[PDB]
């Protein structure tokens, strides 16, 4: 039913058609789904070599790499990393007889692919997966087997078949370097780690999307190799040489704790937000913060300070007064409040450090039955930060203090992380401890900025909420345009990207002042593909 | 304020223009939001006709049914199924003077509107409408009237008015098919279904957008109607006859509860996670797990076997420890623990499936006022399987024991759900029940996986959450090409698809062993449309 | 691994390739990130100017603008409205020496990018902002600084280089009127905000991706610019004039709040789901709602009828029964239930709205440590117009009673807000006030509406959750065409856009029916884009 308005308001131009179109009859094909079993040889990092040889697979793309992981058996306490199926990829090498077609680190596979959701969760998400389970006998199963997917993105993918690799008859050869499982796993102390590690094994299988495609035509294409490099530690800087044609450059800071013991207070397992993570943080420590006993509490370090709440319930700890109120409180007890139950500082007399000190308002409720407070209310500042602190780094030999006046059961309870793709100096990576950063090309400053409006455009423009201060180069539309680049003027001498960053300043009474850090400077290099005698790429210059 | 550095370093060819286009002036058209109403006509299915007949409308899409959902009043308990306003459309059929043009079911058509949170948040998605509301006088309001929206997409919305339906002069009918409200409705025994069912009536009216376009240019096209086939209870097998050019095809199980009452013990309403409905069982199970009495309790049948709970809190139940510690118990009174609530079992002296067994810590504080057990910490291994058992199962003539040890008040509150579009064993379609697939065409192997490779690869491909199972032909970008297919070899005797699945294998002491399933193939044909004497399409061969 | 099937399947014609395509070298570019700062001057609004002029700059688009919001201290409550940097700004102005090339309002802004939710979680959404933090002593810190960057989404924005604003050698001026703080702060009276308001300063930095072109290759394109009218108070009608090329519609609806305080009882603060409104309100009204006391509660206003509960535990309030059980209760004190808490009327013997009416289950346990009651399960039917509801509408002169009759304590704990973007009439824009819609073009009828079928076609269309009723006359993909417009006819008269609603009926005894709305429409008019004497606009008639 057309209004007489709408009828009389269209009342000679060469006009496109938008209402109809050829249907063009594309290049006879037929897709199949192909998985492939490949071989391991074991640094001494496993490695899953994967042949394709089929004289009638013409094209592929999208790998996917499915991994068993392993009933777990024991006591103590285990769970995986999040996306564990992408932790546990070292590198990944595609190539034929002329040589590496592609190839990428774990760490920039994982950025690549952050942005992906249901990647992410193939990968291996869900609480039987992260959560840290409990085992309580030597038979209790702690984790049952189960298969993760990983999506591997290449840029064979971007324009399906478009931009799927051919294989100009030629063998193509894949090669899955893997990471140590002590990365994936996330156990406590009591937890047979030596056992579980020399037994156990990564089982791969690789799949792919092939493509029998009669009388193809092939022509040469445009490729991105990623190029990874780190700087030195705790240095402010890190060059990219030999750049002719680089798409863009990434640039973040990644922690190194090989200085501790990679063991933390808490983790929140399946649950990543950054309020997950510090309910975790503030759940571990209330257990020895606030304490109901008959008499002075028992079992803590001689450097504890444990002192009785007062009836008005302020126990002022130098300038910070504590709320404590816990209901049914027995006759025979009192309640106490441990006012340095991890202390940081550098002299006897100058700022300490204090996480007792972060908490305003402690309410609970005793429980006769169990013997244990049930806290509700709770009013504190702990951040991220706190959470992030490496347990070695409060007990360190610069801290004047003891450090850790916790007790020997909150002590067991500590967790081994070793998850290999954290950035910045927190899980969450939040803090932006870059405060001016600096890109030379040559000798001449290619681009500076203090605030991280580059991360914001990296963000923007990806819809990513993982993003890093990025240069992008390349504004052209994939695979239809040779992509834009930066491009070298060897006569000038601009053949390098430079990059220096001014950190930013922190409390030296901070224990997160110690952490060491690494910069990460990712160049993405232009390549030619060429489809003659099998497949061969070249560095553009 | 460019950098030397830029401006030197683009210091011919012939070059694409990327910073200017000219603007193609498209085809005269004017669209407007055209709304009609139907005749309803009534296996005795409501049947909602409209009739689009306007010479001025050249070409339609975005087809919008809206329902006014009724006030319900009364007694008892109800809600609505998630997304109500999908799960009420049985079939849906769009047709002119030459036959059918497009049809679908409506669970194919929720299926393909399930990656649409817009559309299925408009088809009834919130607290209002799903939470299990009750009513307490033959006078209480239990829902209020509410009108939802539901999308029917089609293929003609791909590609905006380039894949539009064009009314060549021709009359187009729309035929609505509506499930019975039963379908669509979740209550109690309470509550007066038969009076509800006997005045509900559907209320539809239709939507779509039209256009009228001045000398328009009609050109064919090609359009892909999906056809379903429903193999016969309990058989791994499924045949999809006269194949001749297909797109894709997609494979999954749905439960059969015709063997049941379809009564269920809880439902979570508007939550719909994996937690939520586990949380929603464990609700319903502790009331009846942990009783505080003044003496043994009363109001069980005599099989249950219910037991104190001595003063270290365990309750030993053959080889489980149940930990039980509640707060607040008077004086007067005893904790008690029910230890066969719900089993299962074939044999008088084999395994028996007990869901008292599930149970490892149970804490909480008894109030006196209300005179009931708040829970607080749980400690359990409920899945969402035991979530999904019907009640019928735990009765069953197969189980050798009682089966539902709960008191009359607890199965009171059972719920019958008949939601039409559950996939799997359970409600969130977790459990996968096929162990391997093999595909066939003609009588040669065409596909064969263990592992669900395709949904994963489904998934990816489509960014959905919710795959099945789908061999995907057609790679090739939609409207513009002629889609890609898997084409017949009558002379070979290639012309139809087979299927067969082997089910995983469940424990025969698991009520979940007995649930019927159903395998549903989906096979998408090719049909090109024309343009001659109305609208007309033909099957591709 | 190709199946004999599959290699058999596909045993002449002019076939696309789909499978290769040539490599189009784009024009030569570089991009640069480049930033900018404003001259600020003083409605007294302030106003930030940046000028662009470079001769090497061709090309730019995407426009952020960064704020940093200064430390807040001192005493009181005290946050920001989520996402504070868009709702900061009043008006954006992009001219060159020709004129205004593109502006905006603030408010049209914020729904142009009300989908992005990258864009959002820039522009400041956390709990560090938007909590509403206390300040205890004059040096508590309640804010810390931080810096919110607002993503000014442009149409030069859709197709990248294609749509980039050209400079043709002209100077470009970007003008940012910024609204008053009041309208980004939500403070209760006791923050000193006379104070924080004289010392405030907006500091803006702007940003924006340049483009050095070289031999660019410039032509004349199409944009739309919004046009904002707003109907006068109460009034069901607004005009557009000069309508003669309009490529779409708007109409919404905004609550007008300056007949009241702009005060409001409760906010969610960083929540912001309907739920989370319902729940702080709630929150704020349980304090009162329910009192242990010893002996009748004092501190109330003579008006309250605060009345004991009976040991069955139910109070009558005429026709209502409200449940009330509070566990521990000392045995000096009684449980009172105040039942009318809020209440209004416009006749003594009439309806009565009244809040306490609207609970009907109250269950918690009072804490002897912290003499209050800490509340559990809360059964009630409050909605989010309670929650919306304006304190001063309580008291208002019309209300033949007290109105509020809470506790000064409670009364103290009322939030100023002056949020500029709300619509409708509570603050999720949920309740449809508009039960008729009707579009004029000149005389004649364009659209007619009942329910809200264009605000359901609007979100499906733009894939959006925040949609308004919109009338979209273009179809036709972005940039590559000239878009589509609704076209005056000035001989017939047709070159206004007249809308009239109709409001939903509302009891007049229900605070909301008195607050005063107005009536917003939008109209996106065509302009041509021309590069000839720098860069020029005109409207298309």
Redesign the interface.
């Known amino acids: ?11 000679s ?24 079993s490949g071989v391991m040889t074991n640094d001494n990092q496993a490695i899953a070599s994967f042949e394709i040889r ?1 004289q ?4 592929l793309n ?1 790998l ?1 790499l ?1 991994l068993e992981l392993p009933e777990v058996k024991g006591m103590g306490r285990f769970g995986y990393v999040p996306y564990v199926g992408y932790k546990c990829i070292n590198h990944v090498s595609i190539s034929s007889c002329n040589g590496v077609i592609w190839e990428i680190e774990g760490e920039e596979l994982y950025n690549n692919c952050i942005n992906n959701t ?2 992410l ?2 990968s291996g998400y869900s ?1 039987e997966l992260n959560d840290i389970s409990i085992g309580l006998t030597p038979n209790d199963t702690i984790k049952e087997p189960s ?1 993760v ?1 990983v ?1 591997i993105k290449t840029p064979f993918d971007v324009e ?3 931009s ?1 690799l ?1 294989l100009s008859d030629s063998k193509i050869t894949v090669t899955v370097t893997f990471n140590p499982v002590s990365d994936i796993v996330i156990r406590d102390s009591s937890f047979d780690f030596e056992t579980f590690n020399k037994e156990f094994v990564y089982v791969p299988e690789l ?1 792919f ?11 040469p ?2 490729i991105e190799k990623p190029r990874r490099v780190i700087g030195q530690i705790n240095q402010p800087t890190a060059t990219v040489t030999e750049v002719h044609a680089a798409t863009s450059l990434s640039v973040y800071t990644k922690p190194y704790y090989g200085n501790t013991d990679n063991k933390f207070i808490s983790y929140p397992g399946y649950s990543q937000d950054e ?1 997950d993570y510090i309910d975790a943080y503030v759940s571990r420590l209330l257990d020895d913060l606030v304490i109901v006993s008959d008499g002075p509490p028992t079992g803590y370090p001689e450097s504890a300070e444990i002192v009785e709440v007062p009836e008005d ?1 302020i126990v002022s700890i130098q300038d910070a007064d504590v709320y404590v ?3 049914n409180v027995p006759d025979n007890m009192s309640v106490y409040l441990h006012t340095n139950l991890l202390m940081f500082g550098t002299r006897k007399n100058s700022f300490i450090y204090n996480i007792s000190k972060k908490f305003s308002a402690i ?1 609970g ?1 005793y ?4 013997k244990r407070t ?1 806290f ?1 209310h709770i009013s504190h500042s702990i951040n991220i930060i706190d959470t992030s602190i490496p347990v070695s780094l409060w007990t360190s030999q610069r801290n004047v203090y003891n450090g850790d006046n916790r007790s020997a059961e909150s002590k067991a309870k500590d967790l081994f992380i070793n998850d290999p793709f954290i950035k910045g100096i927190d899980f969450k990576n939040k803090t932006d401890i870059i405060s001016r950063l600096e890109v030379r ?2 000798n ?4 500076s ?1 203090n ?1 991280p ?2 991360r ?2 990296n ?3 990806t ?3 993982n993003g890093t201060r990025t ?3 390349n ?3 994939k ?4 992509p ?1 680049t ?2 070298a ?1 060897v006569s ?1 001498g ?1 053949d390098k990207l430079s990059v220096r960053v001014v950190y930013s300043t922190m409390d030296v009474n901070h224990p997160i002042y110690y952490v060491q850090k690494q910069l990460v400077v990712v160049c993405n290099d232009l390549y030619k593909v060429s489809y003659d005698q099998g497949v061969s790429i070249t560095k553009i210059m």
Chains 1, 2, 3 share one sequence.
Request: hydrophobic share 40%; glycine share 4%.
């Open positions: 039913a057309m209004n007489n308005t709408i009828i009389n308001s269209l009342i131009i060469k006009r496109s058609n938008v209402f109809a179109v050829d249907s063009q009859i594309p290049t006879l094909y037929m897709p199949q789904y192909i998985s492939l089929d009638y697979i013409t094209a999208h996917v499915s249901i990647a969760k193939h609480s298969t997917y999506y399906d078949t478009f799927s051919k799949s999307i092939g493509y029998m495609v009669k009388n193809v035509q092939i022509k294409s445009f309020k319930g109120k816990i209901d309410t409720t429980s006769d039955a169990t049930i509700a090309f040559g001449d400053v290619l681009y900025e605030g409006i580059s914001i455009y963000e923007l423009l819809k990513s909420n240069l992008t180069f504004f052209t539309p695979i239809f345009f040779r834009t930066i491009t003027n000038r601009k």
